[PDB]
Design an enzyme around this catalytic site. Structure first.
Site, PDB file in Angstrom:
ATOM      1  N   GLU D  83      50.958  15.038  18.363  1.00 31.46           N
ATOM      2  CA  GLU D  83      51.102  16.273  19.126  1.00 31.46           C
ATOM      3  C   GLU D  83      49.790  16.681  19.799  1.00 31.46           C
ATOM      4  N   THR D  90      43.226  23.384  16.113  1.00 37.37           N
ATOM      5  CA  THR D  90      42.723  23.513  14.741  1.00 37.37           C
ATOM      6  C   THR D  90      41.192  23.560  14.720  1.00 37.37           C
ATOM      7  N   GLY D  93      40.019  26.993  15.785  1.00 37.47           N
ATOM      8  CA  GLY D  93      40.170  27.937  14.677  1.00 37.47           C
ATOM      9  C   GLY D  93      39.052  27.753  13.660  1.00 37.47           C
ATOM     10  N   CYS D  94      38.672  26.498  13.417  1.00 41.40           N
ATOM     11  CA  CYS D  94      37.557  26.199  12.513  1.00 41.40           C
ATOM     12  C   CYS D  94      36.268  26.805  13.081  1.00 41.40           C
ATOM     13  N   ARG D 151      49.195  11.209 -20.124  1.00 42.61           N
ATOM     14  CA  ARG D 151      47.913  11.736 -20.568  1.00 42.61           C
ATOM     15  C   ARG D 151      47.610  12.992 -19.755  1.00 42.61           C
ATOM     16  N   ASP D 177      45.380  15.027 -11.177  1.00 43.14           N
ATOM     17  CA  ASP D 177      45.166  14.949  -9.728  1.00 43.14           C
ATOM     18  C   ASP D 177      46.357  14.423  -8.932  1.00 43.14           C
ATOM     19  N   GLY D 180      52.500  14.469  -8.812  1.00 48.33           N
ATOM     20  CA  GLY D 180      53.273  14.500 -10.043  1.00 48.33           C
ATOM     21  C   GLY D 180      54.776  14.328 -10.124  1.00 48.33           C
ATOM     22  N   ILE D 184      56.263  13.956 -13.704  1.00 46.31           N
ATOM     23  CA  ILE D 184      57.086  15.067 -14.178  1.00 46.31           C
ATOM     24  C   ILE D 184      58.541  14.626 -14.444  1.00 46.31           C
ATOM     25  N   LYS D 215      61.840  18.953  -1.604  1.00 44.71           N
ATOM     26  CA  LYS D 215      62.195  18.592  -0.229  1.00 44.71           C
ATOM     27  C   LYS D 215      63.406  19.253   0.447  1.00 44.71           C
ATOM     28  N   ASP D 291      52.957  12.921   0.639  1.00 39.69           N
ATOM     29  CA  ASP D 291      54.368  12.690   0.934  1.00 39.69           C
ATOM     30  C   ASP D 291      54.730  13.647   2.070  1.00 39.69           C
ATOM     31  N   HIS D 390      49.374  22.961  26.540  1.00 41.78           N
ATOM     32  CA  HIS D 390      50.197  21.783  26.315  1.00 41.78           C
ATOM     33  C   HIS D 390      50.432  20.935  27.573  1.00 41.78           C
TER      34      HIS D 390
HETATM   35  C1  LIG Z   1      43.495  23.841  23.977  1.00 38.56           C
HETATM   36  C2  LIG Z   1      42.664  25.053  23.435  1.00 38.56           C
HETATM   37  C3  LIG Z   1      42.032  24.672  22.061  1.00 38.56           C
HETATM   38  C4  LIG Z   1      41.489  25.319  24.392  1.00 38.56           C
HETATM   39  O1  LIG Z   1      40.737  26.434  23.900  1.00 38.56           O
HETATM   40  P1  LIG Z   1      39.797  27.292  24.869  1.00 38.56           P
HETATM   41  O2  LIG Z   1      39.188  28.533  24.084  1.00 38.56           O
HETATM   42  O3  LIG Z   1      40.658  27.803  26.110  1.00 38.56           O
HETATM   43  O4  LIG Z   1      38.699  26.267  25.439  1.00 38.56           O
HETATM   44  P2  LIG Z   1      37.104  26.263  25.240  1.00 38.56           P
HETATM   45  O5  LIG Z   1      36.557  25.201  26.294  1.00 38.56           O
HETATM   46  O6  LIG Z   1      36.517  27.723  25.554  1.00 38.56           O
HETATM   47  O7  LIG Z   1      36.672  25.847  23.747  1.00 38.56           O
HETATM   48  C5  LIG Z   1      36.806  26.828  22.713  1.00 38.56           C
HETATM   49  C6  LIG Z   1      36.875  26.229  21.298  1.00 38.56           C
HETATM   50  O8  LIG Z   1      38.001  25.346  21.301  1.00 38.56           O
HETATM   51  C7  LIG Z   1      37.730  24.089  20.674  1.00 38.56           C
HETATM   52  N1  LIG Z   1      38.193  23.025  21.619  1.00 38.56           N
HETATM   53  C8  LIG Z   1      38.548  23.096  22.966  1.00 38.56           C
HETATM   54  N2  LIG Z   1      38.967  21.980  23.647  1.00 38.56           N
HETATM   55  C9  LIG Z   1      38.880  21.049  22.626  1.00 38.56           C
HETATM   56  C10 LIG Z   1      39.182  19.627  22.599  1.00 38.56           C
HETATM   57  N3  LIG Z   1      39.625  18.970  23.672  1.00 38.56           N
HETATM   58  N4  LIG Z   1      39.019  18.939  21.481  1.00 38.56           N
HETATM   59  C11 LIG Z   1      38.585  19.536  20.391  1.00 38.56           C
HETATM   60  N5  LIG Z   1      38.264  20.794  20.218  1.00 38.56           N
HETATM   61  C12 LIG Z   1      38.406  21.665  21.385  1.00 38.56           C
HETATM   62  C13 LIG Z   1      36.251  24.061  20.291  1.00 38.56           C
HETATM   63  O9  LIG Z   1      36.112  24.002  18.873  1.00 38.56           O
HETATM   64  C14 LIG Z   1      35.682  25.419  20.726  1.00 38.56           C
HETATM   65  O10 LIG Z   1      34.488  25.346  21.503  1.00 38.56           O
HETATM   66  P3  LIG Z   1      33.120  24.640  21.006  1.00 38.56           P
HETATM   67  O11 LIG Z   1      33.337  23.869  19.594  1.00 38.56           O
HETATM   68  O12 LIG Z   1      32.712  23.592  22.135  1.00 38.56           O
HETATM   69  O13 LIG Z   1      31.940  25.718  20.813  1.00 38.56           O
HETATM   70  C15 LIG Z   1      43.534  26.358  23.346  1.00 38.56           C
HETATM   71  O14 LIG Z   1      44.105  26.617  24.620  1.00 38.56           O
HETATM   72  C16 LIG Z   1      44.638  26.296  22.285  1.00 38.56           C
HETATM   73  O15 LIG Z   1      44.289  26.246  21.080  1.00 38.56           O
HETATM   74  N6  LIG Z   1      45.929  26.251  22.707  1.00 38.56           N
HETATM   75  C17 LIG Z   1      46.881  25.428  21.948  1.00 38.56           C
HETATM   76  C18 LIG Z   1      47.228  26.244  20.757  1.00 38.56           C
HETATM   77  C19 LIG Z   1      48.130  25.593  19.732  1.00 38.56           C
HETATM   78  O16 LIG Z   1      47.875  25.872  18.606  1.00 38.56           O
HETATM   79  N7  LIG Z   1      49.137  24.759  20.104  1.00 38.56           N
HETATM   80  C20 LIG Z   1      50.467  24.831  19.465  1.00 38.56           C
HETATM   81  C21 LIG Z   1      50.773  23.747  18.394  1.00 38.56           C
HETATM   82  S1  LIG Z   1      49.547  22.404  18.302  1.00 38.56           S
HETATM   83  N1  LIG Z   2      54.007  24.011  22.590  1.00 40.83           N
HETATM   84  C1  LIG Z   2      55.244  23.893  22.136  1.00 40.83           C
HETATM   85  O1  LIG Z   2      55.999  24.747  22.532  1.00 40.83           O
HETATM   86  C2  LIG Z   2      55.644  22.763  21.225  1.00 40.83           C
HETATM   87  C3  LIG Z   2      56.380  23.016  20.035  1.00 40.83           C
HETATM   88  C4  LIG Z   2      56.754  21.949  19.185  1.00 40.83           C
HETATM   89  C5  LIG Z   2      56.369  20.648  19.570  1.00 40.83           C
HETATM   90  N2  LIG Z   2      55.668  20.440  20.706  1.00 40.83           N
HETATM   91  C6  LIG Z   2      55.267  19.074  21.155  1.00 40.83           C
HETATM   92  O2  LIG Z   2      55.953  18.840  22.388  1.00 40.83           O
HETATM   93  C7  LIG Z   2      55.960  17.437  22.645  1.00 40.83           C
HETATM   94  C8  LIG Z   2      57.289  17.061  23.270  1.00 40.83           C
HETATM   95  O3  LIG Z   2      57.623  17.985  24.333  1.00 40.83           O
HETATM   96  P1  LIG Z   2      58.760  17.631  25.385  1.00 40.83           P
HETATM   97  O4  LIG Z   2      59.999  17.118  24.571  1.00 40.83           O
HETATM   98  O5  LIG Z   2      59.180  18.910  26.245  1.00 40.83           O
HETATM   99  O6  LIG Z   2      58.274  16.405  26.248  1.00 40.83           O
HETATM  100  P2  LIG Z   2      57.456  16.582  27.581  1.00 40.83           P
HETATM  101  O7  LIG Z   2      56.609  15.281  27.737  1.00 40.83           O
HETATM  102  O8  LIG Z   2      56.523  17.845  27.597  1.00 40.83           O
HETATM  103  O9  LIG Z   2      58.476  16.678  28.801  1.00 40.83           O
HETATM  104  C9  LIG Z   2      59.236  15.560  29.251  1.00 40.83           C
HETATM  105  C10 LIG Z   2      58.721  15.108  30.618  1.00 40.83           C
HETATM  106  O10 LIG Z   2      59.400  13.877  30.944  1.00 40.83           O
HETATM  107  C11 LIG Z   2      60.133  14.037  32.165  1.00 40.83           C
HETATM  108  N3  LIG Z   2      61.379  13.260  32.067  1.00 40.83           N
HETATM  109  C12 LIG Z   2      61.782  12.120  32.750  1.00 40.83           C
HETATM  110  N4  LIG Z   2      62.943  11.516  32.537  1.00 40.83           N
HETATM  111  C13 LIG Z   2      63.427  12.410  31.510  1.00 40.83           C
HETATM  112  C14 LIG Z   2      64.649  12.421  30.740  1.00 40.83           C
HETATM  113  N5  LIG Z   2      65.633  11.524  30.863  1.00 40.83           N
HETATM  114  N6  LIG Z   2      64.869  13.372  29.823  1.00 40.83           N
HETATM  115  C15 LIG Z   2      63.971  14.305  29.624  1.00 40.83           C
HETATM  116  N7  LIG Z   2      62.809  14.464  30.218  1.00 40.83           N
HETATM  117  C16 LIG Z   2      62.474  13.460  31.242  1.00 40.83           C
HETATM  118  C17 LIG Z   2      60.373  15.528  32.276  1.00 40.83           C
HETATM  119  O11 LIG Z   2      60.684  15.958  33.615  1.00 40.83           O
HETATM  120  P3  LIG Z   2      60.486  17.459  34.147  1.00 40.83           P
HETATM  121  O12 LIG Z   2      58.936  17.718  34.398  1.00 40.83           O
HETATM  122  O13 LIG Z   2      61.334  17.596  35.503  1.00 40.83           O
HETATM  123  O14 LIG Z   2      61.040  18.505  33.061  1.00 40.83           O
HETATM  124  C18 LIG Z   2      59.058  16.093  31.735  1.00 40.83           C
HETATM  125  O15 LIG Z   2      57.990  16.109  32.716  1.00 40.83           O
HETATM  126  C19 LIG Z   2      55.648  16.770  21.285  1.00 40.83           C
HETATM  127  O16 LIG Z   2      54.385  16.101  21.310  1.00 40.83           O
HETATM  128  C20 LIG Z   2      55.713  17.932  20.282  1.00 40.83           C
HETATM  129  O17 LIG Z   2      54.839  17.678  19.163  1.00 40.83           O
HETATM  130  C21 LIG Z   2      55.328  21.447  21.489  1.00 40.83           C
HETATM  131  C1  LIG Z   3      54.223  26.985  18.991  1.00 45.08           C
HETATM  132  C2  LIG Z   3      55.082  26.313  17.892  1.00 45.08           C
HETATM  133  O1  LIG Z   3      56.344  26.020  18.487  1.00 45.08           O
HETATM  134  C3  LIG Z   3      54.460  25.030  17.295  1.00 45.08           C
HETATM  135  C4  LIG Z   3      54.101  23.878  18.222  1.00 45.08           C
HETATM  136  O2  LIG Z   3      53.896  24.062  19.443  1.00 45.08           O
HETATM  137  O3  LIG Z   3      54.015  22.735  17.746  1.00 45.08           O
HETATM  138  C5  LIG Z   3      55.357  27.289  16.715  1.00 45.08           C
HETATM  139  C6  LIG Z   3      55.730  28.705  17.076  1.00 45.08           C
HETATM  140  O4  LIG Z   3      56.931  28.979  17.232  1.00 45.08           O
HETATM  141  O5  LIG Z   3      54.807  29.546  17.189  1.00 45.08           O
HETATM  142  C1  LIG Z   4      64.694  12.687  -6.004  1.00 46.16           C
HETATM  143  C2  LIG Z   4      64.057  13.626  -4.955  1.00 46.16           C
HETATM  144  O1  LIG Z   4      63.025  14.350  -5.616  1.00 46.16           O
HETATM  145  C3  LIG Z   4      63.486  12.885  -3.745  1.00 46.16           C
HETATM  146  C4  LIG Z   4      62.438  11.808  -3.986  1.00 46.16           C
HETATM  147  O2  LIG Z   4      62.410  11.153  -5.060  1.00 46.16           O
HETATM  148  O3  LIG Z   4      61.597  11.591  -3.099  1.00 46.16           O
HETATM  149  C5  LIG Z   4      65.072  14.667  -4.423  1.00 46.16           C
HETATM  150  C6  LIG Z   4      65.986  15.354  -5.422  1.00 46.16           C
HETATM  151  O4  LIG Z   4      67.076  14.801  -5.699  1.00 46.16           O
HETATM  152  O5  LIG Z   4      65.628  16.442  -5.921  1.00 46.16           O
END
Ligand SMILES: CC(C)(COP(=O)(O)OP(=O)(O)OC[C@H]1O[C@@H](n2cnc3c(N)ncnc32)[C@H](O)[C@H]1OP(=O)(O)O)[C@@H](O)C(=O)NCCC(=O)NCCS
Ligand SMILES: NC(=O)c1ccc[n+]([C@@H]2O[C@H](COP(=O)([O-])OP(=O)(O)OC[C@H]3O[C@@H](n4cnc5c(N)ncnc54)[C@H](OP(=O)(O)O)[C@@H]3O)[C@@H](O)[C@H]2O)c1
Ligand SMILES: CC(O)(CC(=O)O)CC(=O)O
Ligand SMILES: CC(O)(CC(=O)O)CC(=O)O
Ligand SMILES: CC(C)(COP(=O)(O)OP(=O)(O)OC[C@H]1O[C@@H](n2cnc3c(N)ncnc32)[C@H](O)[C@H]1OP(=O)(O)O)[C@@H](O)C(=O)NCCC(=O)NCCS
Ligand SMILES: CC(C)(COP(=O)(O)OP(=O)(O)OC[C@H]1O[C@@H](n2cnc3c(N)ncnc32)[C@H](O)[C@H]1OP(=O)(O)O)[C@@H](O)C(=O)NCCC(=O)NCCS
Ligand SMILES: CC(C)(COP(=O)(O)OP(=O)(O)OC[C@H]1O[C@@H](n2cnc3c(N)ncnc32)[C@H](O)[C@H]1OP(=O)(O)O)[C@@H](O)C(=O)NCCC(=O)NCCS
Ligand SMILES: NC(=O)c1ccc[n+]([C@@H]2O[C@H](COP(=O)([O-])OP(=O)(O)OC[C@H]3O[C@@H](n4cnc5c(N)ncnc54)[C@H](OP(=O)(O)O)[C@@H]3O)[C@@H](O)[C@H]2O)c1
Ligand SMILES: NC(=O)c1ccc[n+]([C@@H]2O[C@H](COP(=O)([O-])OP(=O)(O)OC[C@H]3O[C@@H](n4cnc5c(N)ncnc54)[C@H](OP(=O)(O)O)[C@@H]3O)[C@@H](O)[C@H]2O)c1
Ligand SMILES: NC(=O)c1ccc[n+]([C@@H]2O[C@H](COP(=O)([O-])OP(=O)(O)OC[C@H]3O[C@@H](n4cnc5c(N)ncnc54)[C@H](OP(=O)(O)O)[C@@H]3O)[C@@H](O)[C@H]2O)c1
Ligand SMILES: CC(O)(CC(=O)O)CC(=O)O
Ligand SMILES: CC(O)(CC(=O)O)CC(=O)O
Lengths: 405, 409, 404, 396
Positions: D83, D90, D93-94, D151, D177, D180, D184, D215, D291, D390
């Site tokens: 992702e 992350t 946030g750190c 143990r 550690d 479990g 268990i 799970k 896991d 994103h």
């Molecule tokens: C992408 C994102 C991190 C950019 O942050 P930003 O504040 O607009 O960008 P900045 O250039 O000002 O950097 C700010 C901080 O972000 C972190 N950061 C930004 N871009 C980064 C990258 N490409 N890789 C690693 N760390 C990054 C840095 O720790 C920190 O700056 P510094 O360590 O250089 O002093 C931010 O838009 C974001 O977190 N959005 C996604 C949020 C999210 O949680 N996604 C949903 C599920 S994953």
């Molecule tokens: N920020 C969040 O909200 C959030 C939350 C949970 C997970 N994620 C992360 O989102 C990622 C996946 O996002 P996404 O599913 O929306 O993928 P996406 O890569 O963001 O979007 C799919 C892209 O492929 C194109 N495309 C081409 N042929 C397609 C087809 N047959 N079907 C569908 N799309 C086609 C789409 O066209 P168009 O440009 O015309 O649409 C689009 O540009 C994962 O990495 C997941 O971890 C994000």
């Molecule tokens: C943004 C979120 O969808 C997580 C992600 O992008 O992977 C969770 C939320 O609903 O805040």
């Molecule tokens: C056995 C189980 O713990 C799953 C696993 O072994 O990974 C699930 C359950 O039946 O509670």
């Protein structure tokens, strides 16, 4: 002819107690004789002496509200108000044996009145029944679900459903599958009635119709708990059941101080940490409030509602926020998605409960707009719950709970 | 003075209607005057005509059960029984306006009776209160949690808690953190009382004592919804609240057929697909039953219980299976982990409700063994719920639900 | 290096400075190793000969290498008259063996059948109006066919595949939560749907300028958190699958009996899950199967939270009620065959093993729908085997053998 | 029998090679296998412990976030994910936490569980068994039998619940550690065998009757805890919320209450009072040989925020996770690459001087990293930056 003779005739193992009224021609006498018969079966024969039974209209009860009757239970009724809601003033009747409930609710009403009143809205209206049916295979139940989701399939089902009553009208279907099982949630308006019997009757006819199209379908139960009636269920919280309502008010800082004996900041800290975080720690689904159930229960008993429906009717999320020029005024809102209520049918057929409904101006059918009396009653319940929330939350914030009730 | 004069004095001196009883001598006249004052504020002045108020003992009600009283609401009471339970026979009073309820419950009792009776057991007994307190930081609340988890910390808390009553005895604590917030679930016996007031009083004292050890602790609310009282909550289902009860019976195949108008097999199929699978589909926590709430509510209203506690007191899982040499008989069990009930206090102070408690042989305190009357009432509630479940499930299985309600409701 | 440590340059910006993805990773590893308690730690974390250009800008940042997850195969899974060889990435011994055993029972029983019931990814933003009477007005507006049309037009305009199907709006005082449900072609769709939502909310704001958009996700979706709304309304793909296992197969392959299986299923998956207060967890280990296929196929493993929702049911079937009928219903499988981790080669390889990689050019959504059916069917195989082991008392024994 | 190849052939690699060749013939697209890696991997550590019918391995990209300043220490957190934005968010946030002086955490409880279902002839009998299990004497003999199998497995308590004649017994035990589950389960099987000696009429239906609960989402895990229960907190300076997080403390708090408390309540969540704890948990789990399927309950989390400082401009944040299922020995932690990530954190293997301390330390790191993740996502939501970030880092 005498009670003693009747008791002997009956005792010939010839007649069960529940059939006494259909033997004599005076309901109260049947009750009196049942009481006498019951007395000789008690470890303490004179225990019925304090259970009242005379001068009550049993004719309205038999065949509608209770069987094998031995008397009635008096529940004290108090009044809270005026509740200033949507530019009207209501005097709310509450039947309870819980000390402080009426006083607390009255105090909340007073804070709302001095605050300029409350506003409410009805967001949805639809009683439900969720039967469980079965097909030979999941592939089959999936086909039935797809069929029900077509406009023509729904149309056929709605026609059959709507034909059973003058007021029951099918609005939608929420269908869910569990392998070869299919749970169908029928949602329909029901005029001013809470609607359970009406909706059940409509469901029954609609399933008979569905069977004509899918003769392999087996109806397992008219209620498969997917309604859901009288059991806690996330489906009621999320999709609503009966009436979904919201109400709100702003309480001026001076009022929170003089009437509620606390501060807006204290009330907000208690609301967030008790009604939101606390309910979350407890694993609550729909119980994000202090005591909606107390208010719902008291009004329900007073107005001839089904008190057992307090289970889902009490679902409520109570929110509080700082408001105003200096963020010292209290904004409060209560959202109740599943108030199951009616002003026609069931206990509302009885005279004392009709008196309480009249007190509120919602007794019986709303001639000029079917369903408006029930909607107005639901709005009153939500507003009264808010009044109650305000007062209890203030008591908790100030540390006054124990010291009163 | 006359009624008109008393009223004029009230209005004129802008006097609270709720204070009328402290002004007049007789309780009934105060209620009469209140009704008169109220009638003038109604869109329909004659509304109160059929709301009764005369010949009722208001002295027991005032200062204990209700304020600003305008009369009483009569709820019809029917009787279901005999309920054959634990070698005893009970005649169960039920206050309701729902037609079919008493008939159905009576049918279930009849089935249980012909089957040789039901057996029940109380599994736990303890009312709870769950206040929320806060510390400056989570690291501090974590320390408090640790302290409360020591035998010595629990000892000091128990001592303060118990000092408030001759009956409230602290049994255990369940403490949980949410950052700097700490939720403490006190669980205690309460003799024959439902115990909410008793327990709240003991909790307030224990918290004051806790504060002596942790002065930086802020007590936010005596109830932080962690009890949990009168709201659906998984904690009550899993840990129990008040009385946890179980009951069971075996209904002979012949009885299921003749009395219940169905078969053991049909009963089992409906139970599994409705009470288990159906409730699971609906997202229910604690509602794995057909209508425990109906029975709980009717008995509660008849016996002076707190009907609003139907919310959690109704939690129930109803199970059914084949039994007997030929697996033709119906085994049924109902398990209710959170029945909140009492035979002393609240509405049980009123005479009509004491009459219903007396019919059951459980009115008031059990002087020889405090808590026995309340426990016995909890057993009766679970057994009656089981009778009700049996009859409704049978009606659902046979396609008799709507028809029966057309006749009695 | 001395440069980076001097100017205090952040390690994540290394690729910009260097002209090689791999060298950026190498230098980042060197910087990182110096800060560790045990500098030689990174030695066993591989990083060479991997295509980082596909990762950068799409799947990961501040990259130091890759983590190999063992991949095993279970099958053939005889589903809908087709046979599948299912790739499973895991470190839990017994998982692949048990799933393979379930596939064998299903195959000897004549195969499984599945159906896709619904398909719609969701996003549930939270917005607020000055008053609850105002939010009620917005909800009524969104519920008119004209209101929905304008919102859909705005939503769908952000994509060639995202097509809004419906809205579920719910109020909490002045707060309004709006659950957008939309098709998404073959993509799991979270980004596509969030994009559409963002545009839709801007459009709604034109109609209600007093509306404050608090968060594009107000947890009403619900993504990656347990929620009754996903269980009840579905999310992504809702699927059901079933099969009948002959009594002889249950005895010989599963080492148990139909009666024992049913008794365990009812008392564990229904009664026990109810005792535990589960919402959506009426199954034995759907989560194990979902996670392993997800990691192998480039899905979002964190979505195992709601994708694992499942109710497993069992009943006696056949001439003498001695055969085992089993069904698994999964209302919220969040999955896709385009986007995210499916952009990487090894994961495309696993999707290709199943014949669902990438876009279904002639009918967008068909590849993702097929993958969802395979997941449900594989969960059912896993369910059969674990339940049999539990009924016969084989669980601990098998794990001492293959998982220690 | 393809799964027995390694038994007959010499090298593990050749067995994987041959199984792959066998599989190839069953695929409609056999050339797909060309991009599934398999060469030069330690299959010896896999066989008999982590996977069967092996055909290769799946590389998951690993990024690093940090330093995470937690409890006076600094950790470089490994995260395996596909992702885009996760590691960057992350890491941000750190960065915010570090500039705020670091986070503090506490382990509140530690006990893996197993919840078998057994049954007696009658509910009256199951009630008797429950009462016996609730005596100190009953608990003592059950603990003796349970503990004799290990143990490290040391029974701490029992929570017994009935449903008629069925009895569900939740065994809670320490596990050194290790996460479990196996340990268990083995202890539970012996304890049940002993319980049966006291009650011969008892039928042991399933060693896991879903009362654990493992799970599957379950309120019992949320309320009673499972594995490690941990809390973490930090205060972020006003200037940092503005400069690093691009938002305000007020906006953060408003989004947190209305999304993580109200929104999760509206959705009917039990334990999901957070933004994306599951993302952090899952990435660390995959990188560290945990896991990953346990992300179901391990993700349970309530995130809280309040104003702090003289003018309420600083942001106080806390995350509480009552059911982190984790370990540093056993399962996937037996493999070398995952050991490298555990070593990165200084928690690899057994804490020889004090068994249980490495797993407890890992649980604190997970809670702290979730908190860093929560901070960054909530700030992006408050600021309206989610979609934009994103499109930049999570889309080819
Ligand atoms: C992408 C994102 C991190 C950019 O942050 P930003 O504040 O607009 O960008 P900045 O250039 O000002 O950097 C700010 C901080 O972000 C972190 N950061 C930004 N871009 C980064 C990258 N490409 N890789 C690693 N760390 C990054 C840095 O720790 C920190 O700056 P510094 O360590 O250089 O002093 C931010 O838009 C974001 O977190 N959005 C996604 C949020 C999210 O949680 N996604 C949903 C599920 S994953
Ligand atoms: N920020 C969040 O909200 C959030 C939350 C949970 C997970 N994620 C992360 O989102 C990622 C996946 O996002 P996404 O599913 O929306 O993928 P996406 O890569 O963001 O979007 C799919 C892209 O492929 C194109 N495309 C081409 N042929 C397609 C087809 N047959 N079907 C569908 N799309 C086609 C789409 O066209 P168009 O440009 O015309 O649409 C689009 O540009 C994962 O990495 C997941 O971890 C994000
Ligand atoms: C943004 C979120 O969808 C997580 C992600 O992008 O992977 C969770 C939320 O609903 O805040
Ligand atoms: C056995 C189980 O713990 C799953 C696993 O072994 O990974 C699930 C359950 O039946 O509670
Ligand atoms: C009992 C209680 C209402 C007294 O409130 P108080 O502010 O300390 O007492 P006050 O004399 O200042 O009266 C304040 C208001 O309370 C209401 N009130 C007080 N005593 C009342 C009574 N005996 N009967 C009816 N209404 C009463 C009045 O509406 C209002 O005064 P006003 O209309 O005459 O101007 C309050 O302590 C309370 O509500 N605590 C219990 C809360 C609760 O909900 N308990 C749990 C559920 S029952
Ligand atoms: C109304 C109902 C009890 C009639 O049952 P039935 O078996 O068709 O009728 P029967 O004449 O054969 O009577 C069977 C038994 O029912 C009970 N019963 C029937 N009618 C009764 C009445 N009017 N009053 C009291 N008890 C009654 C008796 O215990 C017993 O008869 P008995 O005198 O031989 O001992 C049945 O249809 C029913 O229970 N429906 C379900 C209603 C329900 O549970 N709804 C849920 C919400 S309350
Ligand atoms: C390990 C386990 C699969 C062995 O099953 P078994 O029936 O006792 O062993 P058998 O030798 O009779 O083999 C029966 C079937 O199992 C499968 N199987 C057994 N060992 C296997 C292995 N090492 N690798 C792959 N598949 C295997 C085969 O499909 C099939 O054998 P076949 O080659 O004749 O077609 C079984 O004990 C089990 O499933 N227990 C663990 C269950 C579980 O789900 N664990 C918890 C969650 S991962
Ligand atoms: N069996 C169950 O499933 C079940 C479950 C829970 C509770 N209950 C009980 O059901 C009872 C309430 O059922 P119900 O609400 O359906 O009442 P009902 O008394 O069964 O039905 C209402 C009746 O009033 C008539 N009516 C006239 N004017 C009306 C108006 N304006 N609005 C609505 N109806 C009007 C209706 O005509 P039509 O004939 O044309 O519709 C109908 O016959 C309570 O006693 C409750 O305890 C039953
Ligand atoms: N405020 C709240 O938090 C709250 C919440 C829900 C309901 N309620 C209401 O609380 C009321 C019931 O409260 P309660 O159950 O605690 O009753 P209670 O009337 O407040 O307390 C019981 C009293 O009876 C005495 N007593 C004598 N013999 C006893 C015996 N055998 N067993 C127990 N007690 C005995 C007790 O002595 P001691 O003084 O030595 O204890 C005590 O004073 C109901 O009306 C209910 O509606 C209150
Ligand atoms: N079947 C199930 O019930 C189930 C459920 C979910 C997950 N799992 C799987 O279980 C696997 C992990 O099981 P497990 O955590 O119980 O590990 P385990 O590998 O089965 O057991 C740990 C082993 O390491 C030994 N050990 C040495 N030093 C130790 C220390 N400091 N702390 C703890 N143990 C130490 C233990 O000694 P002793 O022999 O003295 O105890 C024991 O032999 C994972 O692969 C997971 O996917 C299984
Ligand atoms: C105070 C309360 O128990 C209700 C009551 O007193 O009747 C509810 C609560 O706030 O938990
Ligand atoms: C029949 C029922 O609605 C209860 C009632 O009629 O009062 C409950 C159910 O089985 O869903």
């Amino acid at each position: 002819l005498s009670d003693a003779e009747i008791i002997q005739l009956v005792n010939a193992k010839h007649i069960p107690a529940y059939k006494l009224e259909t033997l004599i021609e005076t309901h109260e006498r049947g009750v009196s004789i049942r009481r006498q018969l019951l007395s000789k079966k008690l470890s303490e024969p004179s225990s019925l002496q304090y259970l009242p039974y005379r001068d009550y209209n049993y004719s309205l009860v038999m065949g509608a509200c209770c069987e094998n009757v031995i008397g009635y239970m008096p529940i004290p009724v108090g009044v809270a108000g005026p509740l200033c809601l949507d530019e009207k003033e209501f005097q709310v009747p509450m039947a309870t044996t819980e000390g402080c409930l009426v006083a607390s609710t009255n105090r909340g009403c007073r804070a709302i009145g001095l605050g300029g009143g409350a506003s409410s809205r009805v967001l949805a209206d639809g009683m439900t029944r969720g039967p469980v049916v079965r097909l030979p295979r999941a592939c089959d139940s999936a086909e039935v679900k797809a069929w029900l989701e077509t406009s023509e399939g729904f149309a056929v089902i709605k026609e059959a459903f709507d034909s059973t009553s003058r007021f029951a009208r099918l609005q939608k279907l929420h269908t869910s599958i569990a392998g070869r099982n299919l749970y169908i949630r029928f949602q329909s308006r029901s005029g001013d009635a809470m609607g359970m019997n009406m909706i059940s009757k409509g469901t029954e006819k609609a399933l008979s119709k569905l069977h004509e199209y899918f003769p392999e379908m087996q109806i397992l139960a008219v209620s498969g708990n997917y309604c859901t009636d009288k059991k806690p269920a996330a489906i009621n919280w999320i999709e609503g059941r009966g009436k979904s309502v919201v109400c709100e008010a702003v309480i001026p800082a001076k009022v929170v101080r003089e009437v509620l004996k606390t501060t807006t900041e204290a009330m907000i800290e208690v609301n967030i940490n008790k009604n939101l975080v606390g309910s979350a720690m407890a694993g609550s689904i729909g119980g994000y409030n202090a005591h909606a159930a107390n208010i719902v229960t008291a009004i329900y008993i007073a107005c001839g509602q089904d008190a057992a429906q307090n289970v889902g009717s009490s679902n409520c999320i109570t929110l509080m926020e700082a408001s105003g020029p200096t963020n010292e005024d209290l904004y409060i809102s209560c959202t109740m998605p599943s108030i199951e209520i009616g002003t026609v049918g069931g206990g509302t057929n009885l005279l004392p409960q009709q008196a309480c409904l009249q007190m509120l101006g919602v007794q019986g059918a709303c001639k000029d707009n079917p369903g408006e009396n029930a909607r107005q009653l639901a709005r009153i319940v939500c507003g009264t719950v808010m009044a109650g929330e305000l007062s209890l939350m203030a008591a908790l914030a100030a540390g006054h709970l124990v010291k009163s009730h």
